[PDB]
Amino acid sequence: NMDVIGERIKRIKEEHNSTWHYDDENPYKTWAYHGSYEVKATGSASSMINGVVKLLTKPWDVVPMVTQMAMTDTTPFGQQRVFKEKVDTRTPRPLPGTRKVMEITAEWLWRTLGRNKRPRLCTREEFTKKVRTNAADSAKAAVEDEEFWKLVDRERELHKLGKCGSCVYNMSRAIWYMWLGVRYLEFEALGFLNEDHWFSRENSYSGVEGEGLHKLGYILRDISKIPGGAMYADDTAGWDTRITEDDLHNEEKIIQQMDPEHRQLANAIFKLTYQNKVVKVQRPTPTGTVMDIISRKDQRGSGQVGTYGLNTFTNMEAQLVRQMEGEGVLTKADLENPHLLEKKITQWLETKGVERLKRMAISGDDCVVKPIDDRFANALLALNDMGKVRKDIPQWQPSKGWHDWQQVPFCSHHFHELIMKDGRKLVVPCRPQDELIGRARISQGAGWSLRETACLGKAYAQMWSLMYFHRRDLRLASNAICSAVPVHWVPTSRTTWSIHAHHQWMTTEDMLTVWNRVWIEENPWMEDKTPVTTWENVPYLGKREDQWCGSLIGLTSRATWAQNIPTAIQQVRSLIGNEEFLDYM
Ligand SMILES: O=C(O)Cc1ccc(O)c(-c2ccccc2)c1
Ligand SMILES: [Zn+2]
Ligand SMILES: [Zn+2]
């Protein structure tokens, strides 16, 4: 293993030779531990509270989920505890027959995904534009420095030689440029998967990349129209830890469709940074805090460019395999067989594969499958054997599916069909309300002015106006936040890093105009393009559904807050000062 990773550790060892030591009482069991060096204190045991959102959501000061979110441990102590849980494990190797099916399915899937698109290298300019648009700090400074790009060139030259010297994944500018440079090289070689939308629904059939949260429910309702069994949405326990060396070698097959110069750089990313990896992990000690240098040959690096797409790929593959087993194409004897006949697997893929892909909605480790019947519920041999063991259920207990797409969990949400006063239907995203309120009450980091705090609060409010307007308490709180924050103040900072967030709320444009554009004009499931002229015509969930999904409507504390919200708004206004405000109540 040292032939591939040695140079990287050598550069860390040499850079930190002042404090480099081998801590013989390190906690690593399944990862190779190489050494440690002293560092400063990074992360916090608690998160800063957004005073603007908190002041305007008084009834939720007494809500347990809201309090839990106000915590989240990011210190070296919190980093170590989550590591032991799933990260520090080994996945048993799949059986030979299982490995054969995965190989036939991966080959077929990559050809299918590349039927119209050709892989290509991503550029310094694309990465720069991406860094810039997402920064509006030290990443934008690095991108504007010519010396960073000269380091990129030097690392690339090693990659072309099949060597790596600085590509280290993490759990002043010297080590920082090595990290961003590692991400740029990864982006250069594998970025086409995201940039050229290989996992869009049109390209992948099962994929939802670029669709947006506002389209996922409609996609689930369309899947519900396909004849078959129940809709299954099984959660895998720590998906990234279950990515095997066999999965990595199947994912690598995309390089076969690349141009020689691209193939060379993607192969270096696959072989030196995915199939071999050097990781930095913070750890507290009685002496203080150290940074551990560890390595392994399998699993997925969660904070990588290709992670989403390669997880989507491997999950589409794993679900097709489960679908085959449910249909009796794959038996127990087939999975143990090192001489498994390809014919019936190839025939099923060529005749049914695309139709079987359309029965799914797959976003990384998140999947929804509507099989041809319910034999799938008990088709667990290949799923467990591939290492994709379901969370919190005995390995061999049949999966429980749903007969109503509206009950199906997907991407931390469920989706409701609403009837508007004019008879038109909307399919909206929803989640337990405490999770939405709890998230909005948190400000990222510290040292943020009231101005910056109010603008993030405004971002949360406008996200609720656009995605969660159907929740009575969220429309009320949203109107209260937007009434309390100056009209011309632009929402700054993101409400989420979700791949499904299109951030249509990151504006000073009128929210009802934005609502109309998203839900009416640009909505392909809205045949009638008549604009909604008032929020009075923007529907709510049925009162009972709003309550089942966490609404405090019907409670006294809620009626008191609603009646007295102009007072709290006026308090936020007086602390912000003499600015232009609009009353949305
Ligand atoms: O990415 C995921 O798996 C789910 C997820 C999580 C958090 C979110 O804030 C959102 C989200 C909210 C509003 C608009 C778009 C996306 C989605
Ligand atoms: Zn490298
Ligand atoms: Zn709901």
From Swiss-Prot:
Zn(2+) 1 binds at residues 155, 159, 164, 167. Coiled coil: none annotated. Residues 230-380 form the RdRp catalytic domain. Zn(2+) 2 binds at residues 414, 430, 549. Residues 1-585 are cytoplasmic. It is a peripheral membrane protein. It is found in: Host endoplasmic reticulum membrane; Host nucleus. Sumoylation of RNA-directed RNA polymerase NS5 increases NS5 protein stability allowing proper viral RNA replication. Phosphorylated on serines residues. This phosphorylation may trigger NS5 nuclear localization. It comes from the Viruses. It catalyses: a 5'-end (5'-triphosphoguanosine)-ribonucleoside in mRNA + S-adenosyl-L-methionine = a 5'-end (N(7)-methyl 5'-triphosphoguanosine)-ribonucleoside in mRNA + S-adenosyl-L-homocysteine; a 5'-end (N(7)-methyl 5'-triphosphoguanosine)-ribonucleoside in mRNA + S-adenosyl-L-methionine = a 5'-end (N(7)-methyl 5'-triphosphoguanosine)-(2'-O-methyl-ribonucleoside) in mRNA + S-adenosyl-L-homocysteine + H(+). Homodimer. Interacts with host STAT2; this interaction inhibits the phosphorylation of the latter, and, when all viral proteins are present (polyprotein), targets STAT2 for degradation. Interacts with serine protease NS3. Replicates the viral (+) and (-) RNA genome, and performs the capping of genomes in the cytoplasm. Besides its role in RNA genome replication, also prevents the establishment of cellular antiviral state by blocking the interferon-alpha/beta (IFN-alpha/beta) signaling pathway. Inhibits host TYK2 and STAT2 phosphorylation, thereby preventing activation of JAK-STAT signaling pathway. This is RNA-directed RNA polymerase NS5. It comes from Dengue virus type 3 (strain Sri Lanka/1266/2000) (DENV-3).
